[PDB]
């Protein structure tokens, strides 16, 4: 990453390998769980696109959920590179180049250029973008991923409703509709697809159904 | 309105002096009740004839400790201690009748009267009435003190009360 | 999180990949339970919003509880909003303006506004406020993943009085309602539920009796 | 209504017994269908607040709904009251004071300071806000017309495709559910609701499904 | 043909004739509108048939008449 | 309470145990009727708080309907702080104590305090408020403990309708209402909840017949 130098320059940091060793780890025990996103996040902080490659590499097999992430990043790249022209010819000194999608995607550069572009005034984030790309292939492989739909959850006449609100707010977290429609679905398809003892007993508890008075009156 | 109290000073038995005082019941009501119901003595209980036994030159005049006579003592009208009212008044100079405590909401009856300005004592010691009449008795004593606050002559409350 | 330096001053630090998984892994293998609290106020200490905002979102499993902490911080961050209005006219020259409810979380403001809020002259304590937050929220996960109510609790004629009381205590702790109520509970309940030998016993020494004395009457 | 003439002054002119008899006669006929809302918004165009709640009171039974409606614009009312402060003292000649919720209501004003109102310059659109208001409470009353839900439908053995989406989205249209969660309804439960032969027809339709590829694909 | 204190629902009667015919006799008669705002939280929910009296009262007396409604539809 | 005293000095005098004696008395053989209201207005005429909180206090029985005085009472000094906060504004040259809603109430007030209330010039309203919160608090209670709603009185095929009119007004006086809405339930309902044998006579007479003339009518 690129790591401040407290009351100095940002200096340059190569990525530790305890990082890179529990990525590869959280990557091979929990598969592909809608938590791994933020847990990516969070790992890599303030790094080059070299990083997020390396990181991205280093992962072992599921290369169907690679080939689709990479799909992503070159769509991504192909929709900036049309909406923003690229300038060429002589550059004047001191200001870098304009920043292509294939080069805002690290693959057709170096830690440089990268490095620069994270360093000039005012500063254009290279790595904001291509992780902003990474979230979205991500989110779309969590998405592939989901065994069940949202749609279709239903709670068993024996499973509690902690179990049932578990899985379907689980499968909430796996949805990929927009937040009003979240939003939706959570306020009615969660009371409409309870069993019916407790459906009644939320029924009675009529509107402004909040999750912890939900739970409180299934007890039992 | 605002009450006034006095304390007729003695040094070993020998009268020195009357020192009164304005009570602030305006902005610290229930602050200045209660000195003033402690010198009439009221309540069965009070000052009269208890003792300064912290006098620090330049700094204030301590007393209030009718209980146990050294500064671990005392109690209030509302029992042995209370809340702090408020802050609204500082300690702004000489005069300031500010309460004692031992840390926050632990008013009983100590209180201090300065001889200088202390605003370090500021928020941290209710503030309740202030010197009327008797400014250089309240001076005079302070020789009777020393750095650590140890007296070396007994100085007392001879008699208390209220005048208005 | 913000650290010391040696002049003294603070200056913002990438949060550490082994306190993330850290903390994951002891979400995971202890669920909820009245130790994830202490655990947590000790390892986010001066956290800022967005390394909390990481902290919660990198929890993968148990969204229902995410939910509720989520809708209570919601909550939290409007009754902020109403205590304070922001005042109107000309603003001093060596003071400039406050966050708002939402961006003490920390949804809708960048890192380095966060940093500039807490080591600003003087200090505001954002990250102390959504960590209390925090708090709260986990105390209300904890409540709702309390398995009994303190008052069904009875002994049974073979559970030892050591299991008892600790379930009770469990539960007690789980409870939260009050501190002098607590302390009212564990006068009445505690020897009002114990089986009739030791019950007797416990009697036997009046309600002036302690706990150590409590349990090594019943011991052996 | 206000009739404007030809090149010249805009006239008021008395609402029409023709079209008070065409609105009691569909109020009657048709009871609260959600066509009614856009039959009421066509027959009204440009009338003052007297001729609405002339139109209003010509109804005859469903007491429950017209209180329901009355009830609706009294909280319309109170809000536009609540934000908007309202002028007194003396006012200068040719400029109409602020008009309150009651006046703009029409229950505390008259037809000629709804007609001030409504020729000033800049014109203030009261009969647009209380027509506004009217649609609002209408609404809430389709809605409470609905006979069945929206997540409810389910297509019967022998009840063709085309029976099925016309309930589904006569059901729609009463749904009182946001323009976005509005679309992933259509979007999804109409396919995942209908009978399995053409719900296998549809899922090997795919994506991009629009409603007359599906109808045509229903087909036999 | 009847007064308003005489409307009362038949056992198995809907909820929802009984308010209709309820309305259209307090509409019929004649009185202040800030009687009939106790008239109607005096009279319409204690007139219903038990079970859906019960039923109304569990939402509470200030509750709207789409509310109640609801509660006992169907 | 304080009296005034010779000669224009009102001094504290304390309650007299004959008068805490009638009021124990009164609660003890009149339960709690309408008229209690008026006894206790005259039995605690000008009576400082304490003395109020003292009659009370010395009430035997009917715990529950202290206990919504209480909470009454709490209520009306919760709304009595919101209405009577202290705003910012220049400090009066004459400064007079002030009346807390727990000062008002006698909870946290010395005797001392209210007697400076009362005496003072200009006097605070103290015991009149304290007073309007006790008999507002009454009148909860009494129309609580009303036995059969106002719409429930109906005569006998044989009572007579002297015993009729006696506990049909007795029950209207118990009722709460506005004054209108009595002068339109003693014109619409009296007479027609009457036996038809008088009901006959009653209609005779005329609709707008006074109580007299009815009485004397179906007199024997």
């Known amino acids: 990453p690129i790591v401040q130098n407290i009351q100095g320059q940002m200096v340059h940091q190569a990525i530790s390998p305890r990082t890179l060793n529990a990525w590869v780890k959280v990557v091979e025990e929990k598969a592909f769980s809608p938590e791994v996103i933020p847990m990516f996040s969070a790992l890599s902080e303030g790094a080059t696109p ?14 169907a959920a690679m080939q689709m992430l990479k799909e992503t990043i070159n769509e991504e790249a192909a929709e900036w590179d049309r909406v923003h022209p690229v300038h060429a010819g002589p550059i004047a000194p001191g200001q870098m180049r304009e920043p292509r999608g294939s080069d805002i995607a690290g693959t057709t550069s170096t830690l440089q250029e990268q490095i620069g572009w994270m360093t000039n005034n005012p500063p254009i984030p290279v790595g904001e973008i291509y992780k902003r790309w990474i979230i979205l292939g991500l989110n779309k492989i969590v998405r592939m991923y989901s065994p069940t739909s949202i749609l279709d959850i239903r709670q068993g006449p024996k499973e509690p409703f902690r179990d049932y609100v578990d899985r379907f707010y689980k499968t909430l977290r796996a949805e990929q509709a927009s937040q009003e429609v979240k939003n939706w679905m959570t306020e009615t398809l969660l009371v409409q697809n309870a069993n019916p003892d407790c459906k009644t007993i939320l029924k009675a508890l009529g509107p402004a159904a909040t999750l912890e008075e939900m739970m409180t009156a299934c007890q039992g | 309105v605002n009450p006034t109290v006095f304390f007729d000073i003695a040094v070993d038995g020998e009268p020195l002096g009357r020192v009164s ?37 330049g700094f204030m005049c301590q007393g209030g400790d009718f209980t146990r006579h050294n500064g671990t003592g005392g109690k209030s009208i ?10 609204i008044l500082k300690h702004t100079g000489p005069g300031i009748l500010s309460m004692a405590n031992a840390g926050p909401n632990t008013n009983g009856s100590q209180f201090f009267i300065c001889t200088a300005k202390t605003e370090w004592l500021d928020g941290k ?15 005079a004593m302070e020789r009777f003190g020393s750095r650590n606050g140890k007296t070396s002559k007994k100085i007392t409350i001879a008699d208390c009360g209220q005048l208005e």
């Open chain 2, 125 to 139: 010691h209710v503030v309740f009435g202030k010197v009327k009449e008797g400014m250089n008795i309240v001076e």
């Open chain 1, 50 to 63: 070299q990083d997020l490659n390396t990181m991205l590499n280093t992962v072992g097999g599921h290369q």
């Open chain 2, 21 to 57: 005082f304005e009570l602030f019941a305006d902005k610290v009501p229930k602050t200045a009740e209660n000195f003033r119901a402690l010198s009439t003595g009221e309540k069965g209980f009070g000052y009269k004839g208890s003792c300064f036994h912290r006098i620090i030159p």
């Open chain 2, 78 to 87: 509302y029992g042995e201690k209370f809340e702090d009212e408020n802050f």
